[PDB]
Design a protein around this ligand. Structure first.
Ligand SMILES: *[C@@H]1O[C@H](CO)[C@@H](O)[C@H](O)[C@H]1NC(C)=O
Ligand SMILES: *[C@@H]1O[C@H](CO)[C@@H](O)[C@H](O)[C@H]1NC(C)=O
Lengths: 419, 50, 375, 50
């Protein structure tokens, strides 16, 4: 019945209010018109947040609360989790501190965020590995709460994979600033592709140790997760170019694009609720005061929004609350320390690339090398049996070499995909 | 799943093993008729035997 | 050089006695002239009221830790979640009295949570030690669909995999199901004959009633019961032969609080003598920054050792929880608890009392029974 | 190729030199004082295996 969107000081208040007002009026008019109560402030103090929540609650029983942020603190997610554990108001996560989803999904929680979980990032990493035909793995992780389960999941997945890449034992750094065993750990790895599961501060020192030992060669490849390279505008000097990362940012999306999707999801959920029941949900009479345990008499909105379709763009959520078709735009560090879009993952949960193989040039050190020997091969004589990628098997056979060729599409245009 | 009566070469060895190893065998037939190896189904990233 | 620490306590007499205890601890062993300031607040059941009291008492008084005690009523949850979430803005460490739930074990949900009670994961270590000392290899597990249960199952798997041993299978339950008879039957139809129970009190009582009515209390069926599942209806609907576990000096409140506040004072002194300390903002509204001493507190506390506690030396695990706590194996004899075994760290000390088993047998059974029903 | 230490107490290139060798048998042509620090660096990097 009422929609509230929280914004910051990044943009002007008046235009944000106007666009939020005319958002739902674009198409798919609700049977009951909704209003917008937009509150904008630079600070994100918990007392200010709870006072704003109480004011929205007093605002004719607001049913939808869109929460935005501009900082990089993940504790706001915990605070909103605790608030929604009692207010029973669904909240959609937008760009800001709520972007990073790391808290466990409470059974009473009503959160369906736009963030990307680790479980749906390992598949993207595996697809990238398959595209690059890199059959060497090195799970050099760090002891953190909740990473052992991720390591078990990835090892079960690689064991279950038909490709069967080379797997090595997890050589993890026990404690930070060992200064006596870190050298041994770095000597225990003799591969080219290393995956990292740590934080930004510890990744900085790991990269410094790698630079000291000299692990930034042409053959060396590194993949950085989303939680480490989330802050794109802050690039330390100890990060060599070519750090492949998978995450989502505002290069191809905007705050308007996110809030429109959120309000569309809310409208679809309301329509699904009205399809079965004919009762308008009611919130708590008081703001936060309570003497007995709270409960929801009517059924929650979780079973209603399990299957959501928005103009052909199916944006659903899993049982926990994670999205089914996220964005996961792949970014590769530029030669001058910049991030550029090199692919997308929303294309039917697949991977895409611009077909630019060589990007690991000697930058941190000064040592040229000639590794990528360009070869030209033809198919006229019965000496080569090269065939295109088959949908079955693992897109090729176990005994083959990756190839490329320009496929013609039109009799005039020279554009050809490097399939 | 009607009961059949199958016999031959391996039955004598199975009976000898049961007699000498305290075994009570219950012979069953394959519902598919194939030995079973890796096959590709929906979510082809799964290696499950048939 | 004055440091003020707020405290959250249930009743007024507890507040006064703990204030006297911390005032005395300010002079115990080695100490300086001014080290601590005694402040406390009451445990308000209302979430908004308690949050307002915390903001107006601790944040506005330059605190470094929160002295929040266990809820007075064990029946109600009243988990110390809001205090930890509020302290997570500046990575402020908190104090856990007897919060044994595994939710706070992970640092992804609670950035800085410190408790003096060992987590439920130590139950898996106790089971592993008992199997090691009693020669048990094939063990089935009964874990309900809970975060704590999944954490315990993962701990058991990662502790048993190092010996090249794997559990036969693990059954998943739900909080409220009353038709677990099929799951019990399919667990019975297995080679193993040892069962571990780890769930809520009501679910444990229901599954025990189902086992009793399905004749699962016979000889050769060793039952392992966790700490929380030996109370309530367990004391009324359970015959002998129960291998219960109980924490030694766990339910006592003042036993660990004095040691905890002493450790906090020592950590404050070490932080003062180490390097520069940043101060928290006075008001609750106006600042959203992050402490620079957040990780420093964890670094100085995980490696800190103090032998002045009642349980000898004090050590913290990677999750900032109690390490190497004292456990006690509990046995039931005619609805009476009997102490036989104790735990003090990679050791077992059985007593003269004989360990009984279901069915009246006085000898340890074996989990290897070949039914010879080879399909 | 002869992977030799250019100057003593580099502290920035010695690690690179020790990473440039991936063999099991190493011959040394230096003095006692420099051999002491070479062995210390090998111990730090862990080059005393079976
Ligand atoms: C197993 O073999 C022994 C002989 O060693 C025999 O006495 C016993 O009856 C057998 N058990 C069964 C179930 O056949
Ligand atoms: C808790 O322990 C302290 C010291 O060990 C003791 O003085 C006190 O009596 C104990 N509490 C109870 C209820 O026994």
């Amino acid at each position: 019945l009422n929609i509230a969107v929280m914004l910051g000081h990044s943009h002007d208040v008046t235009e944000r209010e106007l666009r939020t007002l005319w958002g739902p009026e674009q198409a798919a008019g609700l049977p009951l018109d909704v209003n917008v109560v937009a509150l904008l402030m630079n600070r994100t103090d918990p007392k200010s947040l709870i006072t704003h929540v109480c004011d929205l609650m007093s605002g004719a029983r607001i049913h939808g609360l869109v929460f935005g942020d501009d900082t990089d603190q993940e504790a706001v997610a915990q605070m909103l989790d605790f608030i929604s554990s009692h207010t029973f108001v669904p909240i959609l996560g937008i760009h800001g501190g709520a972007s990073m989803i790391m808290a466990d999904k409470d059974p009473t929680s009503t959160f369906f965020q736009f963030g990307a979980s680790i479980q749906q990032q390992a598949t993207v990493m595996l697809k990238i590995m398959q595209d690059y035909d890199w059959h060497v793995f090195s799970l050099v992780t760090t002891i953190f709460p909740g990473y052992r389960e991720f390591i078990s999941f990835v090892k079960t997945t690689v064991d279950n994979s038909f490709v069967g890449w080379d797997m090595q034992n997890v050589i993890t750094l026990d404690t930070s600033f060992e200064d006596a065993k870190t050298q041994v750990q770095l000597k225990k790895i003799h591969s080219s592709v290393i995956l990292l599961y740590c934080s930004k501060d510890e990744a900085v020192l790991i990269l410094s140790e790698a630079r000291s030992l000299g692990l930034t060669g042409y053959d060396f490849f590194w993949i950085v997760p989303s939680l480490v390279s989330g802050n794109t505008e802050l690039i330390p000097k100890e990060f060599p170019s070519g750090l492949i990362s998978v995450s989502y940012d505002d290069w191809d999306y905007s705050l308007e694009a996110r809030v429109r999707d959120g309000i569309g999801i809310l409208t679809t959920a309301a329509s699904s609720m009205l399809e079965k029941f004919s009762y308008i949900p009611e919130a708590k009479a008081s703001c936060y005061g309570q003497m007995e345990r709270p409960e929801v008499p009517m059924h929650t909105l979780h079973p209603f929004m399990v299957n959501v379709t928005w103009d052909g763009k199916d944006l659903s959520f899993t049982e926990e609350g994670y999205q089914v078709h996220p964005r996961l735009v792949v970014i590769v560090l530029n030669k001058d320390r910049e991030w550029e879009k090199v692919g997308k993952w929303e294309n039917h949960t697949l991977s895409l690339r611009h077909a630019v193989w060589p990007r690991y040039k000697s930058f941190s050190d000064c040592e040229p090398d000639d590794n990528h020997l360009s070869i030209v091969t033809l198919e006229e004589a019965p000496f080569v049996i090269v065939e295109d990628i088959d949908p079955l098997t693992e897109t090729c056979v176990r005994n083959t070499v990756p190839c490329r060729k320009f496929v013609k599409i039109n009799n005039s245009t020279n554009e050809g995909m490097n399939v | 799943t009607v009961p059949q009566c199958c016999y031959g070469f391996c039955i004598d060895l199975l009976i000898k093993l049961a007699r000498t190893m305290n075994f009570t065998y219950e012979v069953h037939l394959v519902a598919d008729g194939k030995f079973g190896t890796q096959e590709r189904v929906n979510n082809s990233n799964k290696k499950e035997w048939n | 050089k004055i440091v003020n620490i707020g405290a959250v306590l249930s009743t007024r007499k507890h507040e006064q006695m703990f204030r006297e205890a911390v005032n005395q601890a300010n002079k115990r062993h080695g100490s300086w002239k001014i080290q601590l300031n005694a402040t406390s607040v009451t445990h308000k059941p209302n979430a908004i009221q308690m949050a307002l009291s915390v903001c107006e008492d601790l944040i506005s008084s330059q605190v470094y830790a929160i002295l929040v005690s266990h809820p007075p009523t064990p029946n109600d949850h009243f988990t110390p979640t809001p205090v930890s979430y509020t302290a997570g803005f500046y990575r402020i460490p908190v104090l856990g009295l007897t919060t044994r739930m595994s939710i706070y074990s992970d640092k992804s949900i609670h950035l800085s949570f410190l408790r003096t009670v060992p987590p439920y994961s130590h139950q898996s270590s106790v089971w592993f030690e008992m199997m090691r000392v009693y020669s048990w290899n094939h063990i089935i597990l009964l874990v309900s669909d809970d975060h704590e249960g999944r954490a315990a199952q993962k701990r058991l798997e990662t502790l048993l995999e190092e010996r090249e041993s794997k559990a036969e299978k693990v059954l998943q339950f739900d909080p409220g199901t009353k038709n677990v008879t099929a799951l019990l039957m399919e667990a019975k139809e297995l080679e193993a004959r040892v069962i571990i129970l780890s769930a809520s009190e009501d679910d444990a009582a229901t599954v025990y009633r189902a086992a009793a009515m399905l004749n699962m209390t016979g000889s050769g069926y060793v039952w392992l019961v966790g700490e929380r599942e030996i109370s309530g209806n367990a004391l009324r609907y359970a015959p002998d032969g129960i291998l219960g576990l109980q924490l030694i000096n766990g339910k006592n409140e003042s036993a660990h609080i004095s040691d905890a506040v002493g450790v906090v004072a020592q950590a404050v002194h070490e932080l003062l003598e180490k390097e520069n300390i940043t101060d928290p903002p006075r008001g609750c509204v106006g600042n959203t920054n992050i402490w620079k001493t957040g990780p420093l507190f964890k670094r100085v506390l995980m490696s800190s050792k103090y032998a002045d506690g009642v349980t000898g030396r004090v050590e913290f695990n990677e999750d900032g929880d109690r390490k190497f706590a004292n456990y006690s194996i509990m046995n039931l004899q005619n609805r009476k608890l009997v102490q036989v075994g104790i735990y003090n760290g990679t050791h077992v000390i059985p007593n003269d009392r004989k360990i009984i088993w279901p069915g009246g047998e006085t000898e340890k059974p074996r989990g290897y029974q070949m039914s010879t029903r080879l399909k």
